[PDB]
Assembly symmetry: C2
Amino acid sequence: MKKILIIGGVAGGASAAARARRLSETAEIIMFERGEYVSFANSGLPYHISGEIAQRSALVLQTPESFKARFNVEVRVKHEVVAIDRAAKLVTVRRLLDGSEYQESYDTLLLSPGAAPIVPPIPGVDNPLTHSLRNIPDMDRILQTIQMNNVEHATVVGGGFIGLEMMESLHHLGIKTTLLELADQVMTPVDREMAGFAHQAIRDQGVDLRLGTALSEVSYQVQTHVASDAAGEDTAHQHIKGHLSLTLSNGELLETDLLIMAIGVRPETQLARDAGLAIGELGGIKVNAMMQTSDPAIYAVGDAVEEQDFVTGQACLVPLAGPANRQGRMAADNMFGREERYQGTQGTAICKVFDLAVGATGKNEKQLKQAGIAFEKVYVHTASHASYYPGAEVVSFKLLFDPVKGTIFGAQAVGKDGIDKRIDVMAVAQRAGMTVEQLQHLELSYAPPYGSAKDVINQAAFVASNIIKGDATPIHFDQIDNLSEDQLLLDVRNPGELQNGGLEGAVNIPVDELRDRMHELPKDKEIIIFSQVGLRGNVAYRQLVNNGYRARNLIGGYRTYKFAS
Amino acid sequence: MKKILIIGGVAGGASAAARARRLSETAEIIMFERGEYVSFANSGLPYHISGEIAQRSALVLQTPESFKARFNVEVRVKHEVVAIDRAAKLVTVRRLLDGSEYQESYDTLLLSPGAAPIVPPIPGVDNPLTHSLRNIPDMDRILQTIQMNNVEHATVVGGGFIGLEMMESLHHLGIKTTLLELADQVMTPVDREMAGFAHQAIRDQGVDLRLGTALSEVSYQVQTHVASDAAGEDTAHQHIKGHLSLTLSNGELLETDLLIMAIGVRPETQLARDAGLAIGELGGIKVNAMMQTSDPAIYAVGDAVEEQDFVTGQACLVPLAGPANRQGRMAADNMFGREERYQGTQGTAICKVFDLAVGATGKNEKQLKQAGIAFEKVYVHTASHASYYPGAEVVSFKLLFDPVKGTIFGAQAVGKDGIDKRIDVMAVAQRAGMTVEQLQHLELSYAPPYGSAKDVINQAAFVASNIIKGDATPIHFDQIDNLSEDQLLLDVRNPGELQNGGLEGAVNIPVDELRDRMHELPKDKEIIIFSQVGLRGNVAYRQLVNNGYRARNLIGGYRTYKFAS
Ligand SMILES: Cc1cc2nc3c(=O)[nH]c(=O)nc-3n(C[C@H](O)[C@H](O)[C@H](O)COP(=O)(O)OP(=O)(O)OC[C@H]3O[C@@H](n4cnc5c(N)ncnc54)[C@H](O)[C@@H]3O)c2cc1C
Ligand SMILES: Cc1cc2nc3c(=O)[nH]c(=O)nc-3n(C[C@H](O)[C@H](O)[C@H](O)COP(=O)(O)OP(=O)(O)OC[C@H]3O[C@@H](n4cnc5c(N)ncnc54)[C@H](O)[C@@H]3O)c2cc1C
Ligand SMILES: CC(C)(COP(=O)(O)OP(=O)(O)OC[C@H]1O[C@@H](n2cnc3c(N)ncnc32)[C@H](O)[C@@H]1OP(=O)(O)O)[C@@H](O)C(=O)NCCC(=O)NCCS
Ligand SMILES: CC(C)(COP(=O)(O)OP(=O)(O)OC[C@H]1O[C@@H](n2cnc3c(N)ncnc32)[C@H](O)[C@@H]1OP(=O)(O)O)[C@@H](O)C(=O)NCCC(=O)NCCS
Ligand SMILES: [Cl-]
Ligand SMILES: [Cl-]
């Protein structure tokens, strides 16, 4: 009989306990959870706050009792592991109900303690109106402040998925909200020009979005005066729990009834550092492909561990649920001696931003330049399904690739429909090792309500392949303001379109008149073309190079350029 | 100048015309179309009938004048090519206005004449109330008979995708509909147990669905009595364009005001036969992977041609638009000497069936059985996204595979949401050569409005892999009604579920009471287990097999079983 101990009872740990039982009826399996619940839906938390998930019960998927009855796993809630004594193969456990302590032995241990919200060195940030969100109790504390302090304005710090989901929820409740992000964008897995779509959706919701802005100080002021009907004052706009006064990195003041801190999570490494387990250079527990720590009897999974990046093989931190469930499953396997290797993380993710979804997988352009990896990029703006059918929405899609070998580095997409499907297709093609040239041959579902004869993904593969083969010559949005004297900017859109915007200094020849008016264009200038989304631009470009011009086409067209600034 | 001639100005021909122009400004390009429209949305026609697509102009994507302005292609509408003289490189062309003819020389010809609806040898089939649907004038004639003959009841023959779309579209106009199909199922790309979900959806809408049944005779009866208000009669339910009396294959009479024939299409091969071009055994034009016919100067693309099945590499006929459009473009590359090879057809398809979508890629189990290829299947019935999030729907998913090599032969999926996404991911996985064991490491997008932490596809990969590894032992819906004396049937649902249907003779032990009650099961029999969807069944199976019983779990559970009859 192996005795298996599991630390943490949610995505990594609960996943390991269940698989471990299916693998062996003779193992004793004990699972410790310092909180009151196991198997709850962390991802549900922001949606219960807005009432979108109306029922609290929907957030709890198993109980200690249901884990005993189904899996004969002893789940101990309110029991926090406080030490691991490796040589003795004993853990010390604390019963949070009374503070008493006991020890328990293991043959093998799995650590899945997750990652804790990041506490920023901001004076005053510890106070009755400031909260992070990790679990059900942090959610109740948020819900309680909202009710009790009559919250009418809230501020969210941080523009990753947790902070956008909080921003969205609080907006759902009619709360006026301010989002502060220190970066120049929300959602760092996408690149800044892709984020410009979400920035405008956020601003059209009346949210006060402050990018490039840090929170420097928090001042909490207790309310000393309770207004009352009996004293004939208005009480509707009163805050009995107090007031926050925020000082920002530019000395401006923000007044707020509630502050959500959502600036990232840090792996839970204290048990593991106290036990002498190796920690990586990002601050996560270090594990081999088999998710074994520096002690071969101890395994670790999920948001506490560093993972290998699929694309680069380098270490990364990717706190998502998919990888933690599949890791917990595979450490159970390994713990019965199956030697299964985890295959690295692409960091496939997707976040709801009001009516938009913003998706990415693999590496973005900031991560590629930083590691010195040479790359090329394309943009398409193509209907989510046959345009002539109702409800079609523009998907803006970025593909990043090796301009020689055609390796896929990453893909990003933003828009109001079909985003999860395009990201999921690129995730599988990258994982399977397909090159951009091979992407051209994908054979995806087409009927008018669901797709289009040539998909979003096929169009992107043709535009990228045309670059790789020398059939297209690109210029990008960040190059096109900076033209030299042997370049002539040509706009191939129709004249009426120019009023929504265009570029300073452009000659206008509409694409469908170009073949005839082309002698107006001198052959001793490189002609720098642009259209609305890049498509008519390519047609023109082809016409020109077929006639001996030197030319470039603006990838993603004016649309990309416009959301890039 | 190369002189390029193109027969057919829609999906194959038009794609090849536009590509060919991007390839060369000097090439003379002439494209003949026997009808009045080029580049029209064939797929949109049933949708404009219903009024789902409100304006006829949405079905027309180019015009001869747009094709000449943008691409300098001379489109000749109402010109029909009536012969090819290959040895002289001349086609004979008929002007359908006049009946006059001429010749036109070519350097290279492309045939993309499509496929014609199949004409059944039924007596009486040719009459004014019976119509098939290939193009805009077909569509207009159906609309005309609808309005003129005050259609209140119609009959559709054929349960393929066009027949299904026309049934929905008629239902949508308030027209009572009967669907007749000779096979035992609608939508033959999917297996009969998957189409059972579609049968229920269609019946639920009050459509009269008759599987297994052919049309034997049609009788058209012209109307001699026009009811009038002046003679004080009810004019409301009259049909001045007459009446159809249909005789069915089992003797029954069916009376209807309109008959729609959608029994499939047949490649247009007459021109290719008269010219001596090779024709394959399925009756389509025979091409190599460069799209070239038996004459090197003559290419052929689209519905008129036989393609190469991705999975087996034998011949098939797949009349679908994505392949047509990518074949056309590659043919034009080949005409300029680029020697590109098409990579075979997976048959990826999806059809909207009322609220349901039914999709497939690859080979089905009928087709694998016919070719004598050894396979295995799994079913899963998994929420389309996190089910604690509103809107989740059940995706019923079938994976066909090689039970020893893990090769992916095909996948099928039915449900009200997320179908296009799951079939797309499978088409990508199969195309890139992943095996079922590799599917388990797919990292798909997860946020609650869009997926779940383990996607539908991961769940199906785990269940197939358990079977390959020997960790699961399947029984299927069509074996479970048998059962020898060495076998015992165990339902592991909860007692209240047995009220919604069960399997006669089951012993019921709920899985959550099974570890304590297991001694009730004798160990000298194989315990044949079922739960609702297969999931609790697997938990059970593992407990028994870990205690030294012989057992099998029913794959897809009672749900797959139920929809199989
Ligand atoms: C609001 C929110 C929304 C999210 N949305 C998504 C999403 O949409 N998509 C997605 O992929 N991911 C999302 N995530 C992330 C996903 O929840 C995590 O990546 C995943 O839960 C990590 O699993 P884990 O097992 O590593 O850690 P956790 O799920 O954090 O589980 C760790 C458990 O260990 C317990 N514990 C820690 N130390 C001890 C100890 N010493 N003794 C006993 N118990 C201990 C903790 O209390 C915790 O309950 C979201 C997270 C949050 C907070
Ligand atoms: C109602 C309907 C709905 C459909 N829905 C879908 C769907 O949802 N998804 C999907 O993938 N596919 C769908 N299809 C199929 C798809 O439209 C076809 O696969 C694609 O059109 C075939 O392209 P093609 O170029 O081979 O044929 P076509 O589009 O049929 O074009 C051939 C053209 O050649 C012309 N022609 C023939 N002979 C001559 C001649 N001798 N001279 C001059 N002209 C000639 C014909 O008039 C015709 O216009 C649908 C088809 C129909 C009819
Ligand atoms: C649910 C949870 C308790 C684990 O239980 P689990 O039994 O391993 O998981 P599932 O219910 O997903 O079932 C998976 C098993 O069922 C099997 N299965 C799934 N569908 C099946 C079907 N229809 N038929 C037969 N077997 C099936 C799978 O193969 C797998 O078993 P295996 O691992 O032995 O191959 C756990 O992962 C969890 O606590 N997660 C919720 C919390 C969380 O993830 N939070 C993160 C952010 S939201
Ligand atoms: C549209 C049609 C005329 C062909 O036009 P086309 O110019 O080849 O096709 P598209 O608009 O799809 O453009 C594809 C081209 O633009 C390029 N492109 C697409 N988006 C781009 C972008 N944003 N930037 C740069 N280039 C882009 C692609 O690379 C491709 O050019 P390439 O083939 O030389 O690589 C033709 O397919 C047709 O008549 N279809 C309607 C009929 C039909 O298909 N119906 C069947 C059932 S609905
Ligand atoms: Cl454009
Ligand atoms: Cl079940």
